Ligand binder design. Structure first.
Ligand SMILES: CC1=N[C@]2(C(=O)CO)[C@@H](C[C@H]3[C@@H]4CCC5=CC(=O)C=C[C@]5(C)[C@H]4[C@@H](O)C[C@@]32C)O1
Lengths: 12, 249
């Protein structure tokens, strides 16, 4: 739920 | 056949602009808040870089988060050191193409000592005449050089990727133009520089922690950066993190 985790999980 | 160094060159993020507003007088609080907004966006770019860095996404997601949370300041200060070296030979802090801080502009409250420490990092690139490929390999190693004392969830993956990039730094040294005569001396010097970054950045981090926790200073932080610091700060202050050093202290 953190913004860093969302970015790490997001498609590039 | 494409080399790993050629890939590090291609994935390196473009330099960001700050959007600094020159119409208001400089104050320490306003400048620090502007630097933190730029820093949060540089950290977003560094996360996208790490996702593209060969091998990194094979780590457990919790380890990817740990490494970025623990190393973000080292990455940002090392890159600031590089830009300041290439753009000013270490004489000015070249935060962004629209935010260049010279020695007179750094005489604001709190700023001078931190800025001098950032210039010291850039002076090491000058002293050693670091090449772009050496810089790119060292920067990967900074992402991989601060870990929990209790270890990582995917330790064997981590050990393999770190060893891969140690080898790549060696390749970057061997590929500098010249002969092999000085390659061990060079590797010794650059790994001494890597080890020294933990201390050189440590004061920057303590200053950032103070400006983060002490709300009376009115320094603003953007949301993702505040989240990262909130996770990193307790681990660092408790002494639960260790640097991976190449040399005996
Ligand atoms: C004077 C000073 N301000 C800091 C604060 O603690 C302010 O709260 C500390 C170290 C700074 C960072 C140094 C590394 C860096 C390079 C960049 O190009 C963009 C931004 C960062 C990532 C800086 C900014 O966030 C602001 C800092 C945390 O020293």
């Amino acid at each position: 739920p953190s913004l860093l985790k969302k970015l790490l999980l997001a498609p590039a | 056949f494409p080399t790993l160094i050629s890939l590090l060159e291609v994935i390196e993020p473009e330099v960001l602009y700050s959007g600094y507003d020159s119409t208001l007088p400089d104050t320490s609080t306003r400048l620090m808040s502007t630097l933190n907004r730029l820093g949060g966006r540089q950290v977003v770019s560094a996360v996208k870089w790490a996702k593209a860095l060969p091998g990194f996404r094979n780590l457990h997601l919790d380890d990817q988060m740990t490494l970025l949370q623990y190393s973000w300041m080292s990455l940002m200060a090392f890159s600031l050191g590089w830009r300041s070296y290439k753009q000013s030979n270490g004489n000015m802090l070249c935060f962004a193409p629209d935010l260049v801080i010279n020695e007179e502009r750094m005489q604001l409250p709190y700023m001078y000592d931190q800025c001098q420490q950032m210039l010291k990092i850039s002076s090491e690139f000058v002293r050693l005449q670091v090449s772009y490929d050496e810089y790119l390999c060292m920067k990967v190693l900074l992402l991989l050089s601060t870990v929990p004392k209790d270890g990582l969830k995917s330790q064997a993956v981590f050990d393999e990727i770190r060893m891969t990039y140690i080898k790549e730094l060696g390749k970057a040294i061997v590929k500098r133009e010249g002969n092999s005569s000085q390659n061990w001396q060079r590797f010794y010097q650059l790994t001494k520089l890597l080890d020294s970054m933990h201390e050189m950045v440590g004061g920057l981090l303590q200053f950032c922690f103070y400006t983060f926790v002490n709300k009376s200073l009115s320094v603003e932080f953007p949301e993702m950066l505040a989240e990262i610091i909130s996770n990193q700060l307790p681990k660092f202050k408790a002494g639960s993190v260790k640097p991976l050093l190449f040399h005996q202290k």
